[PDB]
Amino acid sequence: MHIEARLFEILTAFFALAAVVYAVLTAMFATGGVEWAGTTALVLTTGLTLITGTFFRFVARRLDTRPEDYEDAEISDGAGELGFFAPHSWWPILISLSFSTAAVGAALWLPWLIAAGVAFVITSVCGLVFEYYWGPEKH
Amino acid sequence: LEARRPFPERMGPKGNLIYKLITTTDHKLIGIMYCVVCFAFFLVGGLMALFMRTELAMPGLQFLSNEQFNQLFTMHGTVMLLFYATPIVFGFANLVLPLQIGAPDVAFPRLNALSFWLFLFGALIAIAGFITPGGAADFGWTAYSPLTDAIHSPGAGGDLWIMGLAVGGLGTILGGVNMITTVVCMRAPGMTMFRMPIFTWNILVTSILVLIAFPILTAALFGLAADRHLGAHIYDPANGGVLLWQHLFWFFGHPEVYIIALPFFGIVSEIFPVFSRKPIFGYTTLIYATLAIAALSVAVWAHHMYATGAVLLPFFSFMTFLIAVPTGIKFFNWIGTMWKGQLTFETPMLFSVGFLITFLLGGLSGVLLASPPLDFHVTDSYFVIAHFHYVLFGTIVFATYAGIYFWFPKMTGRLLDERLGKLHFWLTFIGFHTTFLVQHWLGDEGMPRRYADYLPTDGFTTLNVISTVGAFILGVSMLPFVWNVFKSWRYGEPVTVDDPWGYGNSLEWATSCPPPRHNFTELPRIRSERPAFELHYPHMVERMRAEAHVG
Amino acid sequence: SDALALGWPTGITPEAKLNRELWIGSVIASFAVGAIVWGLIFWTSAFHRKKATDTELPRQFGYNMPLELTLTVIPFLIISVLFYFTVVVQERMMHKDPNPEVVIDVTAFQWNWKFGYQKIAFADGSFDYDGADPERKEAMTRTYLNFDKIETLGTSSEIPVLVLPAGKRIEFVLNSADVIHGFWVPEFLFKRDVLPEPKANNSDNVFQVSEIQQTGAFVGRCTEMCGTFHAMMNFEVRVVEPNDFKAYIDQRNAGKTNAEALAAINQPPLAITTEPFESRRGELV
Amino acid sequence: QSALLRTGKQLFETSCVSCHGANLQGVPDRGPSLIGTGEAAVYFQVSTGRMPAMRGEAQAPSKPPHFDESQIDALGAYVQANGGGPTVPRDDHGAVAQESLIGGDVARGGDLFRLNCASCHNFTGKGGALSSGKYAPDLGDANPAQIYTAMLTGPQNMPKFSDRQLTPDEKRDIVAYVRESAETPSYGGYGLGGFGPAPEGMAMWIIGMVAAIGVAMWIGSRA
Amino acid sequence: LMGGLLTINPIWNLGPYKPSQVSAGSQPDFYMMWTEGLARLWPAWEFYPFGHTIP
Amino acid sequence: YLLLTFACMNDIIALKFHISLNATTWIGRIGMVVLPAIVYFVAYRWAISLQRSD
Amino acid sequence: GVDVEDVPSAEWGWSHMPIGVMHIGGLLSAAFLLVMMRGNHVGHVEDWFLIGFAAVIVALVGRNWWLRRRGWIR
Ligand code: HEA
Ligand code: HEA
Ligand SMILES: CCCCCCCCCCCCCCCC(=O)O[C@H](COC(=O)CCCCCCC[C@@H](C)CCCCCCCCC)COP(=O)(O)O[C@H]1[C@H](O)[C@H](O)[C@@H](O)[C@@H](O)[C@@H]1O
Ligand SMILES: CC(C)=CCC/C(C)=C/CC/C(C)=C/CC/C(C)=C/CC/C(C)=C/CC/C(C)=C/CC/C(C)=C/CC1=C(C)C(=O)c2ccccc2C1=O
Ligand code: HEC
Ligand code: HEC
Ligand SMILES: [Ca+2]
Ligand SMILES: [Cu+2]
Ligand SMILES: [Cu+2]
């Protein structure tokens, strides 16, 4: 994945230039000096793109070329088993409902409702993560 | 000879859909549900806008109070921007991105459904502020710092608004993660990154923009909730709290508008070649323009802040002009695409041209707004209202309708009616221009935005009447589209071929209408950006490789 | 000349004159660009359609590299011209010459205004008044708020009339009691945000007008959402000749209201460009 | 002190004139008249945070305060001079009485609270809903002075208990009862909000029966 | 565990029953609430046949 | 049953989840007719859909 | 009576409800909503809500009955 890491490297470079230029341009010429608000966001945007691109580059340096990344390749190159994809699940809607219960508790500041919503969130995330690993009931 | 049915099955039997709705992990069904729920929220927000315009028709306060009108513009802006536009972006992504790259599914199929349900329930939580006796939030969708305090606006509608926005933002971030991973590492064997369509590029970069923007909004909203429920002093004016909130919110908010702008650029870039019978002009140029727009969208926010007197004007002015340039590159590429084609103006093409005109005038108004001296006069007026309505309506309405008329045959197997499409388009176009072309003049004369009431000596009466007439024309224009969709889901003309538009591209026109589960019973050899076109017209391949370069 | 401004009122200050010139030029340029692009769109839509006599698909061209380079260069020079004019006008508009003739301490509190007349120092050595009132300021330790002797409070049943001289360099210092408000006088062709704590948030709460060419009545409105009565916060500026202004200030030095002194100086006592808003919530109340 | 009245007038003119008319004469369809309400009324309505209000709806809700102690006292003195009415009780040191308002009879305070106060709040001042969007708030966050000025100058849909209807000693006893109810622990375990059988049924259904059904599912088989 | 760690019916806070006084949160145990709920929602329909009342 | 049970508790619901008590009463009055029908429709369709899944 | 193409396990349990019962129940419920308009209340927003819900219920009942009349629902 050379092109993916290249995109994130380009974004990281531009964001680093933007952050440094903003810090220098507001350290002088701004009322309070360094704005301390846009500068932080731009620096950590550089951090975000840097993390993603650097990880992708570690992935791509030790990766042999995939069919997707190799022009003039055949469809038969991609034969075999792709990975695992969940056919169905009703756990996402319960996770969303639990998060909504917790959010309603925090909006109206009802601590009992926040606690119940977090308990429901933990239970539903347990259900989602455990869904395809529960073995047969042993009796 | 073969045996067929005199008419395909209109609807499934009892119990065909509800369990799928509850438990689906199919990106196609998730996209369908996104589109339906987003259009319903659009109807609600438009009803709010109709109430606003009806109040603003005459110089008195005929039926709304000040508080109700404030709640109306606040919740209407919120619903239109966050509960319709970004989710419809993800709905289009779910519909066609896995198809466009030759993939059977999204990367994390349960996370997709989680994102959809987080959307639905967060939107409902934020809207539920109307059920409260005090009413919903009434501090604008921007929610500036001291007015959103516990003292100013003490009701629970603001809190419900904040937390529903947080839940919807979590859903949006998860959707962006899913889309980027799917684009990165699930493409077809022939689909190199420089062979994916423009829509896939735009969705990828839009998801990156989501990942940058939405977490900052979540942090700011958590800070504001701590402020309101704990007396935190995070946004106290004695600190830099006012301008701190403005900085954080706009660092979110301008990336948000480009989040809701780029994918519809991609949609029209898909639609133009199909009805022009020629390739997309400047494919790599369009990719570079998208990348430049996304990069510049993160470091332009404080041009929404020229009036505070607390920001560096030259930096953001220059950055705003510089971000305006690549969008002009995009329009010239689209013109080149339409240039010297065989244009047949079927409904998606008609909405694409409506997009071109509308967003053109919106961009002109925007570069007018970029200049701080001019924004000094026109900020917080209806010139701003007309500007962003023109851009938001060119992008998220005209291009959304073009995408719906385009991919409805692919998602349903039935064709929407062309006569109803033309009627609805012309109604929408005339109504939009009628209701928004005079708010420029309104704002320039001195009518500020977010006013619930004016006076007959102000001079704001005739233009407000014209705008209310246009708003009711726009409300009326939704009847043909709803009727068309409702009738043509079941009794629409069947599609029994791939590519009901003939000259399609992007690999979703190389599979049935609708596509089967797992999206593909075969994949053609991908050698160019438009594999389906060279799959259906092989004799053109040589020509596409000989005539591609004008110079 | 009169229709290209798209509603822009003719300014009453030189800064507003220059801003209106820039706006009209910018509208000209934007309409030119829009004309070009709309012409391309309608040229491609009117002609270039499908016809009955074509059976071969068009030339499949998707790259015109020199045209792309040219059409990328041109917007950069256009925005460069706009940026140059923008910076020149903006520096012309935020100047703050250090010797204003009159200083007004604009205070915006929730749904009314307060004009103070902090300092008046005519250039010609013909009038001088130090309204700075530190006693009440320290008695109100909201220390960022500025108090003056000759105040002008607006009420829910009275629109404050800011009386200014004509041709004298005026200064406005903007402060807010609780929330953000908007100082807009549409005739000034300029507005600013009245922030609670301007110095803590690093804001320019002070802005200056070189002179006001016209003696007249001008409406002003709040242009930042501030709560329920955000549309109910109008004020008026009455620019009178300097002699009538000095007479008004003398009538204010003796204990008298704003309307009393305005009538004493042969002016209408109330606001004439804007009547007060009925405090009634509506019509079906 | 007259400077107290002057600073109170300045505070009122930049924070209360809108909705109240610069002379405590009510602004129509925006707010009531403030003549005769009293410094006790001003103290309650400002220290509780309710004033200034930001909009008109079914009820003015409690907020964080907008004025410090001395600013509240100056506003109260201004309204009292321009008005004429009840005043906040003060102790020997001349400050608003806080600990010298708590009585020694909590059974009398409890009976008085149940006859007069618990109708609209809970048995322990947990709050109760009213007709159309209005409600009786929680008494947990209220110092003795705030309770005193509440029951002495009826804020909003709260009946006014005059100094004859509830003599200051009975008011002290009611204040003592409210404070003890707010500060007392629960003996039987975590008090489920003190609202009675509704949270108890919720706890039964979500903690007791959920546990029972989970245990049955563990013990038993499926299908 | 519930009888230890959760308070149910703390009757010292409610006080003895006097017919002249009442609290805001007057509710029965959950299994009876529907009864009271059915009393809350039914819309005050009464009949007065021939000098009598059917409440 | 659940609607009647929560209608019994509409005062506490309106005090905590800020709603007009009259609004809660009218929601209950409309609901004790509308909600049973919606629930019947949804449950019938859901059961048939479970059969189709099997 | 019903077949197993619409309800797969129609042989295993009670799986058909006569259409007349649901039509009559919908009309009766709309009538009840209408009746609740006359009462001891002074507000009238609830009157609009009652009328709207009765209107949507009657519209659904009439649509279903009409479609079953023309054979669009068999
Ligand atoms: C997604 C972008 C988007 C869209 C599509 C719209 C849609 C419309 N908007 Fe809005 N608007 C904003 C973005 C958008 N708006 C934003 C960001 C704000 C700022 C909010 C704030 O200040 O905080 C705003 C606020 C705003 C203002 C500023 C008001 C003020 O400040 O005083 C105005 C002015 O007229 C307006 C009008 C309209 C009109 C007439 C439409 C029309 O295009 C809508 C047409 C659709 C309809 C009219 C629906 C028809 C209704 C029916 C058919 C009824 C049936 C419905 C049901 C049965 C449920 N809206
Ligand atoms: C779809 C979302 C969207 C998009 C794409 C844009 C695009 C642009 N916007 Fe804006 N904007 C909003 C959504 C959007 N905006 C919203 C929602 C608000 C109000 C928020 C609120 O307050 O609630 C807003 C308000 C807003 C402000 C804040 C000012 C104020 O609040 O008063 C500014 C300031 O610069 C601005 C300018 C621009 C510019 C220069 C572009 C450029 O990207 C446009 C570039 C396009 C063109 C210029 C036309 C095509 C170009 C050519 C044909 C080439 C030739 C052109 C030249 C040579 C110049 N708009
Ligand atoms: C099973 C776990 C329970 C613990 C068991 C262990 C118990 C052992 C000893 C008990 C210790 C508690 C001491 C007794 C003291 C005590 O009771 O602890 C309360 C503390 O606070 C709170 O309640 C917030 C607590 C947050 C966690 C609560 C957990 C709730 C669980 C049970 C949720 C179940 C419900 C499910 C919801 C369903 C979801 C939707 C389906 C009182 O706070 P207080 O400081 O007095 O202020 C009051 C103010 O409520 C008031 O607003 C005001 O301030 C004052 O008037 C006062 O009343
Ligand atoms: C009848 C009606 C209209 C109710 C509306 C109330 C309501 C849900 C307001 C929230 C706004 C809305 C409608 C949001 C809709 C969006 C969505 C999907 C939200 C999902 C999250 C939801 C529904 C949260 C509410 C859950 C709910 C209503 C629970 C019942 C509430 C009750 C009575 C709990 C009982 C209870 C009370 C009252 C305590 O005080 C207490 C104190 C200490 C410990 C425990 C408790 C306790 O259990
Ligand atoms: C418009 C939103 C107002 C603002 C600004 C101020 N007040 Fe007000 N007042 C207003 C309303 C709608 C009400 C009735 C609701 C209530 O909570 O009482 C009031 C009432 C008062 C009272 C109590 C009246 C009594 O009988 O004792 C007081 C003491 C009061 N208001 C004082 C007050 C002060 C000090 C303000 C500036 C901080 C202020 N009000 C502003 C409306 C509005
Ligand atoms: C009618 C119902 C009553 C009755 C009979 C009592 N209270 Fe009050 N109460 C009620 C309302 C509607 C309000 C809010 C007033 C407003 O918002 O302006 C209050 C307020 C209080 C407060 C202040 C709450 C706080 O500090 O946040 C207190 C302390 C208080 N009420 C106590 C109280 C006492 C002791 C009563 C018996 C004498 C009493 N209330 C009766 C509603 C009502
Ligand atoms: Ca009107
Ligand atoms: Cu911006
Ligand atoms: Cu602004």
Ligand SMILES: [Cu+2]
């Ligand atoms: Cu204001």
Ligand SMILES: [Cu+2]
């Ligand atoms: Cu304002």
